[PDB]
Amino acid sequence: VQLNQYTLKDEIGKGSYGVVKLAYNENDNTYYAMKVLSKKPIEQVYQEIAILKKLDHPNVVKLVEVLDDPNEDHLYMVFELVNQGPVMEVPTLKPLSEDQARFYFQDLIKGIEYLHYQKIIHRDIKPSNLLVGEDGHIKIADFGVSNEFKGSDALLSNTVGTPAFMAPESLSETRKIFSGKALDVWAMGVTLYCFVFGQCPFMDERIMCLHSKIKSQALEFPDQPDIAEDLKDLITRMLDKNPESRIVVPEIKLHPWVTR
Ligand SMILES: COc1ccc(C(=O)/C=C\Nc2cc(OC)c(C(=O)O)cc2Cl)cc1
Ligand SMILES: [Cl-]
């Protein structure tokens, strides 16, 4: 099963986009992650490639090349392999320790800060898009619904990403305008909660009820495991339902739980 210089091996990830397969480059004798899509708009895929091309940071994945045959339904995006895979699956019954979560969250901060400087809102931050590399550090993946903006922030009206991680101000259903950086902070907060608890803070298999909880259910902490007050404060500040008072990234950097 060959595609120019790449030999497609087993599937390593999966999603609505298609699949990611391990891949072997015969030229340089090296494994890569191959994202395979099937046209079925396709514009959005090319928006991601444009964003990805501009990105160069240790906590962000690296697109290597794009293989697009006008006469083939499949479109191939070659990424550098982040060899240990997602940092966790949600839900799990073995969440990370605080110090493990702190370690990874520190990577998340650096990556998100870089993307915002580069004027990219990620919009699909979640533990399964945080890939763990050879040195144990996280790289941010799946820019499938990211936005680029001009100015100091994005002014958005569309609702995309993973539902359990969407921010309440993006679920208005009246097409209201909301700012972009605070959407990534919210999802970072859901993510950190997942790190330590192994489940999202707002769950419901009915989508209406999931939206309702995100918009109107006060954040609740499980008795177990008994996490630190300063970590509760940080998650509480990141999951502030009012994006105007929600904690910003420069404050997250300085937060007591992050710096200890
Ligand atoms: C346990 O071993 C494993 C090692 C690596 C993986 C893996 O790489 C999975 C996802 N890969 C990606 C997906 C993307 O979106 C769908 C994008 C993007 O579109 O930005 C980039 C990448 Cl790299 C999985 C398991
Ligand atoms: Cl996840």
* CATH number of residue 62's parent domain: 3.30.200.20
Q: Which amino acid is at 180?
A: G
* CA dist 94 → 118, 123, 150, 222 (Å): 35, 26, 41, 14
Same domain, 58 and 140: no
Q: Based on the domain organization, do 220 and 133 belong to the same domain?
A: yes
Looking up tokens 């609740």 gives 220
Resolution in A: 2.5
Ligand 2 center to residue 85 CA distance, Å? 12
Residue whose entry in the numeric block shows the structure tokens 């533990």: 127
Domain boundary among 59, 81, 103: 81
What is the residue type of 117? Y
For ligand 1, atom 3, which residue shows the shortest CA distance? Answer: 85
Cis peptide before 225 (omega within 30 of 0): yes
Residues 200 and 247 grouped into a single domain: yes
Does ligand 1 come within 6 angstroms of the Cβ of 15?
yes
Query: Cβ–Cβ contacts within 10 Å for residue 130, how many?
Result: 26
Proximal ligand: closest to the CA of 134: 1
Structure tokens at 138: 């996280």
Active site (annotated) includes residue 124: yes
Which protein residue has the closest C-alpha to ligand 1 atom 6?
85
Q: How many domains, the chain?
A: 2
Domain finish residue from 81, 115, 146: 81
Q: Which ligand is nearest to the CA of 142?
A: 1
Residue whose Cα lies nearest atom 14 of ligand 1: it is 142
Question: What method did the depositors use to determine the structure?
Answer: X-ray
Give backbone dihedrals phi and psi of 213, rounded to 5 degrees, phi first.
-60, -50
Q: Do the Cβ atoms of 130 and 87 come closer than 8 Å?
A: yes
Q: Which residues of 158-196 are buried (b: 16+ CB within 10 A; e: fewer)?
A: ebebbebbbbbbbbeeeeeebbbbbbbbbbbbbbbbbbb
Ligand 1 pocket, residue 19 CB under 6 Å: no
Please give the residue range of the domain that contains residue 157: 82-260
The catalytically annotated residue of 107, 124, 142, 240 is 124
Q: Which parts are annotated binding residues for ATP?
A: 12-20, 35
Pair 231, 220: CB distance under 8 Å: no
Cβ atoms of residues 79 and 63 within 8 Å: yes
CB 151 within 8 A of CB 158: no
Domain C-terminal end among 50, 81, 112: 81
Dihedral over alpha carbons 168, 208, 158, 188 (to 10 degrees):
40
Residues of each annotated binding site = 12-20, 35
Tell me, in angstroms, the distance from the centre of ligand 2 to residue 129's CA. 7
Four-CA torsion 154, 237, 220, 139, nearest 10 degrees = 60
CA 191 / ligand 2 centre spacing (Å): 8
Q: Give the H/E segment covering residue 73.
A: none
For 84, counting Cβ atoms within 10 Å of its Cβ (0-12 exposed, 13-18 middle, 19+ buried), the class is: middle
- 85 C-beta closer than 6 A to ligand 1: yes
CATH code, domain with 236? 1.10.510.10
Tell which one of 8, 9, 12 to mutate to probe ligand 1, the residue whose CB is within 8 A of the most ligand atoms.
Answer: 12
Residue 175 · residue 157 · CB < 8 Å: yes
